[PDB]
Amino acid sequence: SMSVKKPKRDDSKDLALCSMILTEMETHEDAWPFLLPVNLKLVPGYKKVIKKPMDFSTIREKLSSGQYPNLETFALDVRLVFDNCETFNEDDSDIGRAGHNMRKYFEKKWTDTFK
């Protein structure tokens, strides 16, 4: 509360560490469904169904330009990529499986880096 603060967690490396995590996600072989925005003209249903489209390149630009106020807002956009994927793709599809693999991969890096 007022004039009463928990001890200050060092957050000064968070930007660099999110960037490295994101680099690792970008270079994973199963990243291909997530590298770019889903083409809303060419994929029937996507525009109407997925209220908040997200992809790695868009996370990368937000990161580079100071649009994440903290590391949790960054984790939300990453998870949004996978939650969208699960919304639109059957689990037993190459893209569906990619999404499950990439979420697992992200979550481990997140824990090992920050928890």
Curated annotation (Swiss-Prot):
Localization annotation: Nucleus
Functional description taken from the UniProt entry: Regulatory subunit of the ATP-dependent BRF-1 and BRF-5 ISWI chromatin remodeling complexes, which form ordered nucleosome arrays on chromatin and facilitate access to DNA during DNA-templated processes such as DNA replication, transcription, and repair. Both complexes regulate the spacing of nucleosomes along the chromatin and have the ability to slide mononucleosomes to the center of a DNA template. The BRF-1 ISWI chromatin remodeling complex has a lower ATP hydrolysis rate than the BRF-5 ISWI chromatin remodeling complex.
Bromo domain ranges (all copies): 9-113
UniProt tissue specificity: Expressed at varying levels in several tissues, whereas a smaller transcript was expressed specifically in testis.
Name of the protein described by the UniProt record: Bromodomain adjacent to zinc finger domain protein 2B
Organism: Homo sapiens (Human)
Subunit architecture: Component of the BRF-1 ISWI chromatin remodeling complex, at least composed of SMARCA1 and BAZ2B, which regulates the spacing of histone octamers on the DNA template to facilitate access to DNA. Within the BRF-1 ISWI chromatin remodeling complex interacts with SMARCA1; the interaction is direct. Component of the BRF-5 ISWI chromatin remodeling complex, at least composed of SMARCA5/SNF2H and BAZ2B, which regulates the spacing of histone octamers on the DNA template to facilitate access to DNA.
Protein family according to the UniProt entry: Belongs to the WAL family.
